[PDB]
Amino acid sequence: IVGGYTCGANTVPYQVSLNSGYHFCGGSLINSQWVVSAAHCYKSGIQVRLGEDNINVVEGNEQFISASKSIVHPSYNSNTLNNDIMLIKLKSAASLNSRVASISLPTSCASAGTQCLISGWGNTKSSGTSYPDVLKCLKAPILSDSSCKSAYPGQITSNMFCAGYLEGGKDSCQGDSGGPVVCSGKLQGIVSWGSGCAQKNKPGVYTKVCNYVSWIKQTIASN
Ligand SMILES: *[B@]1(C2=[C][C]=C([C]SC([N])=[N])[C]=[C]2)O[C]([O])C(=O)O1
Ligand SMILES: [Ca+2]
Structure with a gap:
């Protein structure tokens, strides 16, 4: 920004960081088990990081949850970016609280x-x-x-x-x-x-x- x-x-509290050894994309928590992000952020091996403020320090409110599944929109075109949306499923439900919210x-x-x-x-x-x-x-x-x-x-x-x-x-x-x-x-x-x-x-x-x-x-x- x-x-x-x-x-x-x-x-x-809905902002997530997508991590593959490093922050590489944001996303949005839509319920306890799913994140919406851009399809152009797709990669394998994603860990979802909830409750973050400083992404390089563990501050005490984080939840780190591996992705189990990613679903790129069926009509995503990476050249035009039409339909640039993907769903990411968490392997386990996040614990919703004041700092982690859909x-x-x-x-x-x-x-x-x-x-x-x-x-x-x-x-x-x-x-x-x-x-x-x-x-x-x-x-x-x-x-x-x-x-x-x-x-x-x-x-x-x-x-x-x-x-x-x-x-x-x-x-x-x-x-x-x-x-x-x-x-x-x-x-x-x-x-x-x-x-x-x-x-x-x-x-x-x-x-x-x-x-x-x-x-x-x-x-x-x-x-
Ligand atoms: B993204 C990414 C960041 C920002 C835009 C908006 S550019 C603008 N003029 N508002 C887009 C797409 O691209 C890379 O893959 C990254 O990790 O951020
Ligand atoms: Ca942190």
Whole structure:
């Protein structure tokens, strides 16, 4: 997250870190046994880390749970990033508490202009590199579909939306992949793609979670 703020420990209790020897992606806890992340975060050997603030220090509220199964969306296209969503099943249920909590799925899609909370442990620089150890947050509005399409001509599908700031300076960035975009208390987006970070006229592009609720529900009812 570039141009954001330190969330505060465990104030985003649905945020997970995906770990394969190192943090490589975020995700969102949707119930005690499942995480939603980006399909472009898929790899084997994932450990889910819940209750994190500082990802390099054991602070006392963590739960580390290996993944048993990952399910990439059936129509995921890694070239276009259309349908950039995946479910990850935990090998054992998380213990839900004040610091480890699920985020609700949407029942309606969010509106342009709504302010959302984007979070992650990604780079905090638009040029150069610095990784925070503690969770960073950004408040960002959903952009109109016409601004989004004008920013990324030929590339925005109905399964995507833009959020952020056209003037740049405030955005998600490398390492935030797969993490939440929460609007009105519901998981509405997943950190998906963009051109650079915090560049002018190049906001973040997020997977439109509301279009996937029926797939998520059916998938978790059978796995
Ligand atoms: B991801 C990843 C981070 C950030 C985006 C948004 S870019 C922007 N302009 N808002 C995307 C995708 O990619 C790498 O795989 C990583 O681990 O983070
Ligand atoms: Ca920790």
